[PDB]
């Protein structure tokens, strides 16, 4: 680690938090969904014509203006405070996020723009970015990965303008939060909304993948919105989740000057649903130079659905490491971070097989199995060693483990 940390020109004092490492700082400024061709781009084309389109088809629909192009870089405010993430939230832990310290971090979502951009007056918009999190290694997970956030606000008249004696319906009142609905709204007004969200959601969805999908909204959970949904897609014989949404809490909205609207708000993983669309087997494919996948991706025009074709899949050699965590001094995460270090992307998956106490001298050990496969190549017994011992050195010199190998 170190003392000060230096990102796009600007200097951020190292604390008890900070917890970056130099290898996903090489990440940050690549932007992927402004790349010109890219699977990530394409997707965030197809979305943003849609609402264009659909901002032309019917009078109904606002312009939704497009902002992809903001600095990860965002303070836990904006990031959790903002959205009403309680202090204690387990989002926030240390091991889950990458913090330049206290006070900053690379965005976990990008969620966290909702209240700058509605406090600037905005009433729909579009947002697009690399979000970074601490999670596990496998073919489905990565450090850095995109998302579309979309607010859309209403104003009463707007809600029901469409019925007889309207303006005799409200958005607000003051009953209690249920299932369905939070204190301050009107189930009148939050059935409109959430109609009108799952509806976007749904031709939206249709013009992505045509009459043909099978999708299931399920009722969860976020600290922003109330009811909230995940919509899910069924793919290879499994329910995927591929976005979060529901109503925006009104204190939210409340709190960036619009006292008077009620909304929606949606955040959808950009990789999962291109996996998914284009039957991409693994998110290291979004990250590969490799033409054999790029070159698939050239289109004419954004609709010419393109017909993915599968790479090679290559061997893998499977390597497992041992060793005792420090005294109470440890996070898997901080493991995981150090295969993606020294490893990069020639790992495919790190499981944790094996933990247990040692009873003499009171310290844990960890077995984690190391699958090196990598997405362009056979990979030589040679090579893995290699870097396998580097790891393992790495383990110690870094983690504090003591190599039971
Ligand atoms: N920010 C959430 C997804 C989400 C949920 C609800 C409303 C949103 O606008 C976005 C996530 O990253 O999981």
Same mark, same amino acid.
């Given at each position: 680690?170190?003392?000060?940390?230096?990102?796009? %020109?600007?200097?951020?004092?190292?604390?008890?938090?900070?917890?970056?490492? =130099?290898?996903?700082?090489?990440?940050? @400024? =690549?932007? *992927?969904?402004?790349?010109?061709?890219?699977?990530?781009?394409?997707?965030?084309?197809?979305?943003?014509?849609?609402?264009?389109?659909?901002?032309?088809?019917?009078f109904?629909?606002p312009?939704?203006?497009?902002?992809?192009?903001?600095?990860?870089v965002?303070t836990?405010?904006?990031?959790?405070?903002?959205?009403?993430?309680?202090?204690?939230?387990?989002?926030?832990?240390? %091991?889950?996020?990458?913090?330049?310290?206290?006070?900053?971090?690379? =965005?976990?979502?990008?969620?966290?723009?909702?209240?700058?951009?509605?406090?600037?007056?905005?009433?729909?918009? *579009?947002?697009?970015?690399?979000? +970074?999190? =601490?999670?596990?290694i496998?073919?489905?997970? +990565?450090?850095?990965?995109?998302?579309?956030?979309?607010?859309?606000?209403?104003?009463?008249?707007?809600?029901?303008?469409?019925?007889?004696?309207?303006?005799?319906?409200?958005?607000?009142?003051?009953?209690?939060?249920?299932?369905?609905?939070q204190?301050?709204?009107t189930?009148?007004?939050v059935?409109?909304?959430?109609?009108?969200?799952?509806?976007?959601?749904?031709?939206?969805?249709?013009?992505?993948?045509?009459?043909?999908?099978?999708?299931?909204?399920?009722?969860?959970?976020?600290?922003?919105?109330?009811?909230?949904?995940?919509?899910?897609?069924?793919?290879? @014989?499994?329910?995927?989740?591929?976005? @979060?949404?529901?109503?925006?809490?009104?204190?939210?909205?409340?709190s960036?000057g619009?006292?008077?609207?009620?909304?929606?708000?949606?955040?959808?993983?950009?990789?999962?649903l291109?996996?998914?669309?284009?039957?991409?087997?693994?998110?290291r494919?979004?990250?590969?130079?490799?033409?054999?996948?790029?070159?698939?991706?050239?289109?004419?025009?954004?609709?010419?659905?393109?017909?993915?074709?599968?790479?090679?899949?290559?061997?893998?050699?499977?390597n497992?490491?041992?060793?005792?965590?420090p005294?109470e001094?440890?996070?898997?995460?901080?493991?995981?971070?150090?295969?993606?270090?020294?490893?990069?992307?020639?790992?495919?998956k790190?499981?944790?097989?094996?933990?247990?106490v040692?009873?003499?001298?009171?310290?844990?050990?960890?077995?984690?199995?190391?699958?090196?496969?990598?997405?362009?190549?056979?990979?030589?017994?040679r090579?893995?060693?290699?870097?396998?011992?580097?790891?393992?050195?790495?383990?110690?010199?870094?983690?504090?483990?003591?190599?039971?190998?």
């Open positions: 680690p170190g003392s000060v940390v230096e990102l796009l %020109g600007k200097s951020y004092p190292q604390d008890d938090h900070s917890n970056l490492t =130099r290898k996903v700082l090489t990440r940050v @400024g =690549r932007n *992927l969904h402004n790349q010109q061709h890219h699977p990530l781009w394409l997707i965030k084309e197809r979305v943003k014509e849609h609402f264009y389109k659909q901002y032309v088809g019917r109904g629909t312009l939704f203006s497009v902002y992809d192009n903001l600095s990860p965002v836990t405010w904006q990031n959790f405070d903002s959205l009403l993430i309680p202090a204690d939230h387990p989002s926030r832990k240390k %091991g889950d996020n990458y913090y330049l310290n206290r006070t900053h971090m690379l =965005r976990a979502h990008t969620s966290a723009h909702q209240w700058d951009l509605l406090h600037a007056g905005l009433d729909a918009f *579009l947002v697009v970015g690399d979000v +970074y999190r =601490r999670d596990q496998d073919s489905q997970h +990565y450090p850095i990965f995109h998302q579309l956030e979309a607010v859309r606000l209403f104003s009463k008249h707007e809600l029901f303008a469409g019925i007889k004696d309207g303006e005799s319906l409200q958005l607000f009142e003051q009953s209690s939060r249920s299932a369905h609905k204190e301050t709204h189930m009148e007004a059935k409109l909304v959430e109609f009108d969200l799952k509806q976007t959601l749904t031709r939206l969805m249709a013009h992505l993948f045509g009459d043909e999908l099978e999708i299931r909204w399920v009722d969860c959970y976020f600290p922003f919105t109330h009811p909230s949904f995940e919509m899910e897609i069924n793919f290879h @014989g499994e329910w995927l989740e591929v976005l @979060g949404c529901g109503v925006m809490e009104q204190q939210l909205v409340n960036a619009a006292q008077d609207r009620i909304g929606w708000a949606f955040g959808l993983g950009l990789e999962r291109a996996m998914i669309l284009y039957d991409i087997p693994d998110i494919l979004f990250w590969c130079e490799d033409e054999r996948f790029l070159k698939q991706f050239c289109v004419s025009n954004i609709n010419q659905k393109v017909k993915f074709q599968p790479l090679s899949k290559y061997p893998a050699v499977i497992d490491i041992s060793f005792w965590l005294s001094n440890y996070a898997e995460n901080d493991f995981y971070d150090l295969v993606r270090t020294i490893g990069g992307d020639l790992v495919e790190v499981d944790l097989i094996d933990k247990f040692h009873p003499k001298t009171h310290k844990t050990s960890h077995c984690y199995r190391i699958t090196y496969r990598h997405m362009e190549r056979t990979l030589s017994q090579e893995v060693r290699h870097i396998h011992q580097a790891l393992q050195e790495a383990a110690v010199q870094l983690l504090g483990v003591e190599g039971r190998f």
